[PDB]
mmCIF file of C-alpha atoms in Angstrom:
data_model
loop_
_atom_site.group_PDB
_atom_site.id
_atom_site.type_symbol
_atom_site.label_atom_id
_atom_site.label_comp_id
_atom_site.label_asym_id
_atom_site.label_seq_id
_atom_site.Cartn_x
_atom_site.Cartn_y
_atom_site.Cartn_z
ATOM 1 C CA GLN A 1 97.995 110.401 120.448
ATOM 2 C CA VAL A 2 96.294 110.509 117.013
ATOM 3 C CA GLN A 3 97.040 113.796 115.232
ATOM 4 C CA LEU A 4 95.789 115.096 111.917
ATOM 5 C CA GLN A 5 96.400 118.536 110.541
ATOM 6 C CA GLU A 6 95.231 120.008 107.297
ATOM 7 C CA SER A 7 97.052 122.522 105.189
ATOM 8 C CA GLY A 8 97.064 123.927 101.697
ATOM 9 C CA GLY A 9 93.906 126.029 101.609
ATOM 10 C CA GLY A 10 93.765 129.653 100.600
ATOM 11 C CA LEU A 11 92.081 132.204 98.429
ATOM 12 C CA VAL A 12 91.684 130.944 94.881
ATOM 13 C CA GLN A 13 89.986 132.060 91.661
ATOM 14 C CA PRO A 14 87.047 130.208 90.145
ATOM 15 C CA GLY A 15 88.316 127.511 87.810
ATOM 16 C CA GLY A 16 91.562 127.381 89.788
ATOM 17 C CA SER A 17 93.246 124.452 91.502
ATOM 18 C CA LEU A 18 94.661 123.899 94.998
ATOM 19 C CA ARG A 19 96.108 120.873 96.671
ATOM 20 C CA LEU A 20 95.277 120.209 100.314
ATOM 21 C CA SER A 21 97.463 118.108 102.586
ATOM 22 C CA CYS A 22 96.767 116.296 105.804
ATOM 23 C CA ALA A 23 99.725 115.222 107.930
ATOM 24 C CA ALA A 24 99.045 112.229 110.112
ATOM 25 C CA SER A 25 100.778 110.882 113.157
ATOM 26 C CA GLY A 26 100.183 108.825 116.239
ATOM 27 C CA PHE A 27 98.639 105.874 114.368
ATOM 28 C CA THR A 28 99.601 103.639 111.478
ATOM 29 C CA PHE A 29 98.496 105.779 108.607
ATOM 30 C CA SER A 30 99.120 103.155 105.939
ATOM 31 C CA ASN A 31 96.636 100.769 107.667
ATOM 32 C CA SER A 32 93.833 103.311 107.785
ATOM 33 C CA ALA A 33 91.255 104.314 105.219
ATOM 34 C CA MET A 34 91.101 108.089 105.075
ATOM 35 C CA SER A 35 88.641 110.690 103.955
ATOM 36 C CA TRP A 36 87.939 114.355 103.445
ATOM 37 C CA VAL A 37 84.840 116.259 104.585
ATOM 38 C CA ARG A 38 83.988 119.933 104.266
ATOM 39 C CA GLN A 39 81.798 122.456 106.002
ATOM 40 C CA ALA A 40 80.700 125.857 104.869
ATOM 41 C CA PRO A 41 79.552 128.236 107.644
ATOM 42 C CA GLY A 42 75.898 127.468 108.441
ATOM 43 C CA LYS A 43 75.732 124.766 105.743
ATOM 44 C CA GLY A 44 76.218 121.321 106.996
ATOM 45 C CA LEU A 45 79.115 118.912 106.834
ATOM 46 C CA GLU A 46 79.513 117.261 103.466
ATOM 47 C CA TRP A 47 81.575 114.134 102.858
ATOM 48 C CA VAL A 48 83.945 114.757 99.940
ATOM 49 C CA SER A 49 86.094 111.691 99.144
ATOM 50 C CA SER A 50 87.684 108.585 100.621
ATOM 51 C CA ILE A 51 90.580 106.320 99.943
ATOM 52 C CA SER A 52 91.536 102.846 101.091
ATOM 53 C CA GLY A 53 94.572 102.265 103.283
ATOM 54 C CA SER A 54 96.652 101.095 100.309
ATOM 55 C CA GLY A 55 95.290 103.631 97.867
ATOM 56 C CA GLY A 56 93.848 100.885 95.699
ATOM 57 C CA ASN A 57 90.316 102.340 95.789
ATOM 58 C CA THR A 58 88.910 105.836 95.967
ATOM 59 C CA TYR A 59 85.402 107.218 96.142
ATOM 60 C CA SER A 60 84.128 110.761 95.608
ATOM 61 C CA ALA A 61 80.932 112.583 96.315
ATOM 62 C CA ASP A 62 78.544 113.585 93.574
ATOM 63 C CA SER A 63 79.304 117.283 94.089
ATOM 64 C CA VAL A 64 83.055 116.921 93.515
ATOM 65 C CA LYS A 65 83.564 113.781 91.432
ATOM 66 C CA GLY A 66 85.786 114.332 88.456
ATOM 67 C CA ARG A 67 87.142 117.549 89.903
ATOM 68 C CA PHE A 68 88.616 116.576 93.292
ATOM 69 C CA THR A 69 91.219 113.810 93.444
ATOM 70 C CA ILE A 70 92.144 112.123 96.701
ATOM 71 C CA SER A 71 95.521 110.515 97.072
ATOM 72 C CA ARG A 72 97.953 109.523 99.729
ATOM 73 C CA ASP A 73 101.609 109.009 100.347
ATOM 74 C CA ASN A 74 101.953 106.225 102.819
ATOM 75 C CA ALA A 75 105.754 106.687 103.128
ATOM 76 C CA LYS A 76 105.249 110.268 104.305
ATOM 77 C CA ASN A 77 102.069 109.710 106.326
ATOM 78 C CA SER A 78 100.192 112.255 104.258
ATOM 79 C CA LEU A 79 96.774 112.502 102.702
ATOM 80 C CA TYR A 80 96.080 114.845 99.777
ATOM 81 C CA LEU A 81 93.128 116.393 97.950
ATOM 82 C CA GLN A 82 93.893 117.828 94.544
ATOM 83 C CA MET A 83 91.072 120.251 93.933
ATOM 84 C CA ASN A 84 90.604 121.301 90.325
ATOM 85 C CA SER A 85 88.040 123.376 88.468
ATOM 86 C CA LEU A 86 87.119 125.183 91.665
ATOM 87 C CA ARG A 87 83.666 126.631 92.042
ATOM 88 C CA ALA A 88 82.019 129.135 94.375
ATOM 89 C CA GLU A 89 80.160 126.264 96.019
ATOM 90 C CA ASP A 90 83.524 124.666 96.979
ATOM 91 C CA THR A 91 84.253 127.419 99.482
ATOM 92 C CA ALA A 92 84.380 125.779 102.874
ATOM 93 C CA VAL A 93 86.622 124.565 105.669
ATOM 94 C CA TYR A 94 88.076 121.188 104.697
ATOM 95 C CA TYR A 95 88.926 118.477 107.229
ATOM 96 C CA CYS A 96 90.619 115.177 106.877
ATOM 97 C CA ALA A 97 89.423 112.116 108.739
ATOM 98 C CA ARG A 98 90.967 108.715 109.483
ATOM 99 C CA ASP A 99 87.989 106.521 108.497
ATOM 100 C CA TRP A 100 85.970 105.985 105.330
ATOM 101 C CA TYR A 101 83.134 108.257 106.416
ATOM 102 C CA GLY A 102 84.825 111.636 107.241
ATOM 103 C CA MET A 103 83.621 111.153 110.829
ATOM 104 C CA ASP A 104 86.929 110.645 112.694
ATOM 105 C CA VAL A 105 88.189 114.220 112.681
ATOM 106 C CA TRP A 106 91.219 115.436 114.713
ATOM 107 C CA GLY A 107 92.390 118.643 113.005
ATOM 108 C CA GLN A 108 91.454 122.265 112.841
ATOM 109 C CA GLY A 109 90.778 122.253 109.112
ATOM 110 C CA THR A 110 92.016 124.297 106.259
ATOM 111 C CA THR A 111 89.955 127.011 104.597
ATOM 112 C CA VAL A 112 89.379 127.174 100.858
ATOM 113 C CA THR A 113 87.737 130.363 99.672
ATOM 114 C CA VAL A 114 86.894 130.887 96.048
ATOM 115 C CA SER A 115 87.201 134.562 95.352
ATOM 116 C CA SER A 116 84.578 136.641 93.597
#
């Protein structure tokens, strides 16, 4: 009965910021490493960032490092992605995942579109 659902996307200006959320239930969130992955239509899936169960370690992809900040709130069973300095190439559907590799995906995603 694992559930994950993303929220927080929207239409944003270049250089803007957004914060995505992922609400988790049906498993012990605090014991699970979590990740974000994104997919632009016709481009492939791209791993974005991961975080350890405790939040003691995070990792980010070369394309987003230093701009996108993963975090979590274990008390509220929620995963976050603070996206700053948004670029055209960040437009995509974003998905959370309950593993290190952005490969255990349960939600419908949340769309981030950087406006022109």
